[PDB]
Design a binder for this molecule. Structure first.
Ligand SMILES: *[C@@H]1O[C@H](CO)[C@@H](O[C@@H]2O[C@H](CO)[C@@H](O[C@@H]3O[C@H](CO)[C@@H](O)[C@H](O)[C@H]3NC(C)=O)[C@H](O)[C@H]2NC(C)=O)[C@H](O)[C@H]1NC(C)=O
Ligand SMILES: *[C@@H]1O[C@H](CO)[C@@H](O[C@@H]2O[C@H](CO)[C@@H](O[C@@H]3O[C@H](CO)[C@@H](O)[C@H](O)[C@H]3NC(C)=O)[C@H](O)[C@H]2NC(C)=O)[C@H](O)[C@H]1NC(C)=O
Ligand SMILES: *[C@@H]1O[C@H](CO)[C@@H](O[C@@H]2O[C@H](CO)[C@@H](O[C@@H]3O[C@H](CO)[C@@H](O)[C@H](O)[C@@H]3O)[C@H](O)[C@H]2NC(C)=O)[C@H](O)[C@H]1NC(C)=O
Ligand SMILES: *[C@@H]1O[C@H](CO)[C@@H](O[C@@H]2O[C@H](CO)[C@@H](O)[C@H](O)[C@H]2NC(C)=O)[C@H](O)[C@H]1NC(C)=O
Ligand SMILES: *[C@@H]1O[C@H](CO)[C@@H](O)[C@H](O)[C@H]1NC(C)=O
Ligand SMILES: *[C@@H]1O[C@H](CO)[C@@H](O)[C@H](O)[C@H]1NC(C)=O
Ligand SMILES: *[C@@H]1O[C@H](CO)[C@@H](O)[C@H](O)[C@H]1NC(C)=O
Lengths: 121, 430, 107, 431, 114, 115, 430, 103
């Protein structure tokens, strides 16, 4: 059912924070632990993340996450520090545990990926 | 000649108010300490007539428990503003299925400011949600058309502690010490105490949990055994271990519905797909019934008997209803009471808006509990209704049975120190 | 406390509202018994004889049949319907005793 | 000669204490204590005991207990606050004429058991309880809502005038006056001691005292000072005057859900026979009764052509004869009786739903409609008069305490003082 | 001459002892009945009359308030008249009664007898 | 003199002895005052006296208890100190007072002093 | 040699009980009259141990005051319907400028009829209002998201009257008459009383206003002195006059907020000069403080003492506060306690939403008072805390510390009339 | 798990079993996950954690023991013509570039 929107697009100044947000759709934004693909020209690797599901947020593997799960606004948000010009690649948003009930522990990849959008730092 | 005596050791049947002696609601209310060294005095050659079915100590316990329960619940969050139409759909699992027994409901709830309403959602148990129209997704909470629903305070524990009922000055409690006493008639071995032993209040239907055990074999107790219009309490001399669990970890969402009015509801469920179940050893249960049957047939000889499931009514009477770690379980006992004369799993349901009292003027809402729950308890007796062959069913009761089964040994009497007797010695004057 | 309750006379020897009601009644019962002993002129005594003769109408059994052979509890039942009679007589005998004590030209 | 001290002495003093009552009804529930099946009375010899009904504290105690029970009983009931919305009102057309005169048909938008939903509901209401919001407008509100808490009386509890005996606590006694012509104040030279009063029915009315005691004297006129025009005159009769009050119609009740087990009751329709209410008072009985009252007034007011006039003004509570006829509150016009100079008379009467009841008006009671017709049969046992050359009397009244004072004029409470002080006899019982 | 009345002293004495808002009122009534009972018993006790409905003392029966008595005439038919004539001195008489008992104790505390 | 008067008196100079919430508090205070009064009276009655200021009984002193002569302990010590100096023997004295009265009740049980 | 029992013995034991209150709310509640000529009894050769820090009368007076405060506020107008978004701007005055401390707020409320709404205006203090957003004129009242706010009924001033606490039968109050008593330990000049003297229940923080002055020289009382965590109560032997005022002329309106109930909103401010201020004579303050230091140096000798003005913590801690004419003042004392060892004006602010005591439920709304207000009070003592020479801070403390300064001379004792002593006399006639 | 899968863009007309086996330092905490794309689009889950199938999967295979997560892609042909890569959902926020094994 889920139809995550592409992140707000940007053409940021170099080393500007990569501030963007992905509108949520056809999912509970109140659950749905979310992640921001760590987009790159070759392949995304690792992610920034936040979850309404656990009242929590976490640091990115690089730069910063500055992530939030704005369940109230029906949107994912992040603003990684020091966006590199090389960061100008599209990042999809997706979430895990969007279900009413989970048959397993939270140790699985999200599949509902957004069309994505790039920030041309 | 008449002689006046004072301090004569005699008494009369009487009804008085007994006092209750020892976060926890029971501990908070029954603040009066118990006697660390209680005494019991055997009365040589005293015959006393007892009747557990007419014992006002049972009614007193019933009334005081309800009063405490109401006092405890009263100063808590009201759920009135949540009595709105709900938009409910299928509680989709992370599995390619719908978890049964749950609904995913959304609604427009007024918040702290009266100018704002927000769309909130929560998972609810199917049992507490009622459909407003056929062929429709619109639902209401089950009790919003009948009475107020109040959320129990998360800071208040209802876990029972042993309660001692104590007579006031001028009164004493007589206790029956005949191990084979059946609840009515004379007891030929009695003693006097000031306080009862500690009885944990237990709320349970069908099966009697965490009580005392019988001595001298299994005792079948009834107001009238012949009369099939009355309840039979079976008091066991050996317990049956029962282990109940909820094999999941719930996470909850907090919705503010007023000025500090925090409402809690299930946000998500992580865990197994079985909502709840109870584990009863098979051989233990099978031996227990054989012994119960041996005793039932001494009252109903040369007849075959059978055990059947409860015949009808709502969950409180048809299932085994109990409090497990603050959660409310409604277990299917048809797996036990199905026989004619290694373990057994009883599937269980969970409910959040409950009564458990004959009064429906107010309901309690049980907020979700985080973490997994395991309860181990002792089955000390059975509640049976009798209906050639005889049929016994694990029927319900007025919840007084959970006290009648412990208070059957006690009677309250008033002490009457004055009396007169004849002599042959006229008062000397000056 | 009760001791040999199961013995014959021949062996005789020596929320806030509810709580307030219990305390008050304990006091009322205590005082009522003390007042009654005072009226009969038995204040301060555990055993007090009087000027009222024993009536055969209350019990026509003798002392060897009433004492030694009857349980205090049985005795109270046997004469339960005379308690108010004996008590009325006890009050009057004390009233008559006062009448004589309070006669004039005597002190 | 030295002092002798006595205890158990038959002495008493005036006192004010708490009295208790003795026998789904509200009074039966509260005044749960049984009466003495064999009540005693002690006759006193030569005791010129002073009685004063006007200052008698038993009246005030009875008044306060009545108010307390009324409120205690009404409190655990449905509030009608949810109905205080603008009402859209038109003509009530239950009759063939399309007019029923005293009632209006009002529609309103009220929240149901679903807090997010409101529905258009309607009911018929009496004009006496509906307030117009502005001129030339169909927009109305419930009377007194903006100034008070309006609570619906619950059908689960009965209210009727069950006679109640008031009993003294231990240490106290009630003295009773047995002088047939005592007349309110002064020494009563034939008195007795009782533990409980006779049973007094808590009947509430404004002009004519109903279902009370009859006087031993033909008519007795009681006042603090009959020549003082600032005080109320209570006239007690030795004969009952029968009055039959009728509401010759049948109301169809409807029910509006307003919350979680909360519901409002209202008239949905009226079956027929337009006269709203009326009372039948015997004509010949009244003429004789009123003339007899005058004969007694002439001994205080020895003037010819003494007159009677209707209550001069104020709201219905003081201009009409108010009573509870059986769930409905009647406000009847007695101007047809109190109009004279010294087979039946029909008194026009109206029905009201929101009742102030007492002098305290920060709260009000709503009387649900009563299904079926009412024929209340009662007798006048006394009249309440006030006075303005030749004097004029009117059916005026007091603070509704007159209603119990009119029965509690024979009783007073005294404290028992069993310890004597110092009579003498003997010396001292030394050794 | 209030002679017969002495035999009713017992009858009166025995009659002295046997909805939240209501509950308070009822408890107050019960408590006060007890307090009044005990106040009288305590007073008879301090005067040395415990256990007696009728007792005698040693007081001056002072001429400053006590006039000459009569041969069972003065000793009036009505108790309520004494409540108006003798009672006027209650506040001095009760004090005299306590002092007379205090004097008896002083005469026999522990100086004489054992 | 006053309610406690010379509370600081030497034993040898002892001389002689001489609205709902609010409603609940007041009732409790009244009830307790009554209970305390009655307990003292009941306690004295069971020791063989009432109506007395001073009671003499059939109970000897231990003489290990004070381990002092009467000429000092019933003399050069204030009543207030007297209480402080009982040294947790109060319940012993009270038990002994009950035992001696009980012995008296046993000796008076035959009760043959009749017509 | 033999035991004698005595009754009516003038001895006692330390005890705690319920004292009764004896001679608005204060006179209404403490309806019981007092003795116009209390019979104080001097006790010859009696030494008693007093302890003002452990004296439960302080706690009892505190709890009774809270109960009365709440009983008075309870049957009054609720301000629940005012939890709406407020659209606020900068309030003006009769002086065509801006009042820095006031906001002019417009809002939509329920009127007499439930189906109607009206737009109303009211003035509020900056300290009564919190923003719902950043750079946007959207506000709420400060306690809306925490608890209900109840408006005080205008008919009750709560003006302190002397209160006397009286012993119940069986109890007595002992009083210490040592003019240099430090609050604990033996008192060698004692007397008994029936009731305490009349203590006015005046509420303040840093400076104790009104009550009696010390008979002796300035006495510094502390539970420990050495422990910097304890409250130091400085009881002056000379008062300091303090004159406080709100020179502005206020006017008010009345907003119906539903049937029956109405809100006493502030209408307008005219004659605006200063929100509030207090005047303390300079010479008096300097000598008074110097004398306090002279005494502090007896505990901390050979040190040059300084003060640290206004301490730290919240408004209720760092700012002096009092009820003046019904309005609540929060005054800046930093110019009084910044010294090193003709008048000083202390700037002062006003609040409408009041939260006295540690509980923030039942917040009180103080209706505005029309016209201008002046108060003259007596500074009778200081509350100081500690923290190379010693540094002292003015500061608040538990509210209980306010009555400790009045009740330090009194103790509750139970009278124990029964006792036993030797006679060497045996009972006569067996 | 901060290491790549042993992929070399091996591919075939059918049964393109380029089983790189998510050799992410053999420490995936058994949360190996797979996704693939043949478009300028987000990759779709190819397989669920470890051996579990992706929802609505076809022509696919997976295995894992936090290591050696062989994924032979069943006998997939056209279905396998996509770039694909491994990830460890429960370890080091790991991702393998893996390879464009898209036939
Ligand atoms: C009538 O009822 C009585 C109870 O009121 C029974 O008496 C009880 O018998 C028990 C066994 O003999 C006693 O237990 C023992 O008590 C001692 C201390 O008293 C302990 O040291 C022992 O360990 C304990 N025994 C065990 C196995 O734990 C009870 O104390 C005793 N109770 C009382 C109040 O005396 C009578 O036996 C019973 N009579 C009949 C005919 O059934
Ligand atoms: C120990 O405490 C005693 C009180 O409990 C103190 O006694 C008080 O001494 C005062 C004089 O210093 C007396 O003042 C008198 O009060 C009356 C009131 O009506 C006035 O007329 C007198 O003129 C006035 N005396 C003078 C000299 O002005 C108090 O009345 C008296 N209190 C009592 C109850 O007797 C002791 O002084 C005190 N001792 C020590 C060492 O501090
Ligand atoms: C300390 O005690 C003094 C009194 O010794 C208190 O001052 C008094 O305070 C009250 C209330 O503010 C004043 O009452 C008012 O007076 C005006 C006069 O116009 C009247 O209109 C009001 O209705 C009300 O009655 C009283 O006059 C004032 N007394 C004096 C002498 O000025 C002071 O408030 C106390 N301090 C503290 C902190 O409690
Ligand atoms: C009692 O509880 C245990 C778990 O605590 C249940 O044990 C599992 O049962 C299933 C049945 O299909 C087996 O596949 C699992 O391997 C068992 N787990 C373990 C650890 O042994 C047990 O079945 C319960 N009793 C009953 C009657 O169901
Ligand atoms: C009142 O108005 C309603 C409007 O639907 C109508 O059905 C009803 O018949 C009317 N009743 C009377 C008495 O006018
Ligand atoms: C508050 O705003 C209203 C807007 O109509 C204005 O009339 C009023 O004068 C203002 N009051 C103040 C003090 O600014
Ligand atoms: C510092 O202390 C000395 C005494 O040691 C004193 O004389 C002096 O006045 C103090 N300083 C101040 C500023 O008061």
């Amino acid at each position: 059912x889920x139809x995550x929107x592409x992140x707000x697009x940007x053409x940021x100044x170099x080393x500007x924070x990569x501030x963007x947000x992905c509108x949520x759709x056809x999912x509970x934004x109140x659950x749905x632990x979310x992640x921001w693909x760590x987009x790159x020209x070759x392949x995304x690797x690792x992610x920034x993340x936040x979850x309404x599901x656990x009242x929590x947020x976490x640091x990115x593997x690089x730069x910063x996450x500055x992530x939030x799960x704005x369940x109230x606004x029906x949107x994912x948000x992040x603003x990684x520090x020091x966006x590199x010009x090389x960061x100008x690649x599209x990042x999809x948003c997706x979430x895990x545990x969007x279900x009413x009930x989970x048959x397993x522990x939270x140790x699985x990849x999200x599949x509902x990926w957004x069309x994505x959008x790039x920030x041309x730092x | 000649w008449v002689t006046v005596y004072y301090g004569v050791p005699v008494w009369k049947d009487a009804e008085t108010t007994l006092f209750c002696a020892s976060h926890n609601v029971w501990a908070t209310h029954c603040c009066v300490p118990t006697d660390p060294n209680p005494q019991e005095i055997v009365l040589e050659n005293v015959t006393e007539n007892f009747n557990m079915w007419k014992n006002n100590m049972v009614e007193q316990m019933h009334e005081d428990i309800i009063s405490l329960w109401d006092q405890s619940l009263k100063p808590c969050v009201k759920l009135t503003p949540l009595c709105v139409t709900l938009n409910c759909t299928n509680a989709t699992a992370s599995n390619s299925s719908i978890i049964e027994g749950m609904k995913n409901c959304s609604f427009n709830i007024t918040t702290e400011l009266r100018d704002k309403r927000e769309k909130k959602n929560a998972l609810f148990y199917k049992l507490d949600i009622v459909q407003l129209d056929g062929n429709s997704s619109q639902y209401r909470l089950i009790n919003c058309n009948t009475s107020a629903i109040t959320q129990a305070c998360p800071k208040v524990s209802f876990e029972p502690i042993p309660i001692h009922y104590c007579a006031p000055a001028g009164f004493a409690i007589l206790k029956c010490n005949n191990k084979t006493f059946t609840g009515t008639g004379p007891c030929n071995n009695v003693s006097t105490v000031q306080c009862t032993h500690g009885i944990k209040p237990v709320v349970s239907t069908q099966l009697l949990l965490n009580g005392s055990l019988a001595e001298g074999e299994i005792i079948i107790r009834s107001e009238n055994i012949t009369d099939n219009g009355k309840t039979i309490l079976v008091h066991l001399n050996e317990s049956v271990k029962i282990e109940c669990t909820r094999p999941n970890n719930k996470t909850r969402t907090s919705i503010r519905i007023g000025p500090g009015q925090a409402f809690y509801a299930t946000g998500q469920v992580i865990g197994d797909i079985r909502e709840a179940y109870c584990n009863i050893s098979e051989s233990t249960w099978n031996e227990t019934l054989g012994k119960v049957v041996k005793q039932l047939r001494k009252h109903f000889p040369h007849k075959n008997i059978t055990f059947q499931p409860s015949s009808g009514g709502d969950l409180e009477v048809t299932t085994h209803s109990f409090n497990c770690g603050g959660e409310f379980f409604y277990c299917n006992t048809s797996g036990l009471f199905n026989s004619t004369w290694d373990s057994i799993t009883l599937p269980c349901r969970i409910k959040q808006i409950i009564n458990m009292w004959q009064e429906v003027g107010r309901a309690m809402y049980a907020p979700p509990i985080q973490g997994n729950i395991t309860c181990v308890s002792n089955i000390t007796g059975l509640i049976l209704t009798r209906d050639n062959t005889e049929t016994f069913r694990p029927g319900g009761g007025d919840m007084r049975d959970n006290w009648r089964s412990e208070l059957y040994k006690y009677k309250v009497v008033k002490i009457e120190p004055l009396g007169v007797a004849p002599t042959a010695c006229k008062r000397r004057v000056v | 406390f009760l001791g040999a309750a199961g013995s014959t006379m021949g062996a005789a020897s020596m929320w806030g509202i509810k709580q307030l009601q219990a305390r008050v009644l304990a006091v009322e019962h205590y005082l009522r018994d003390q007042q009654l002993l005072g009226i009969w002129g038995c204040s301060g005594k555990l055993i007090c004889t009087t000027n009222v003769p024993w009536n055969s109408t209350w019990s026509n059994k003798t002392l060897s049949e009433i004492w030694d052979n009857m349980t205090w509890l049985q005795w109270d039942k046997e004469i339960s319907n005379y308690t108010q009679i004996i008590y009325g007589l006890l009050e009057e005998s004390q009233n008559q005793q006062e009448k004589n004590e309070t006669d004039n030209l005597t002190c």
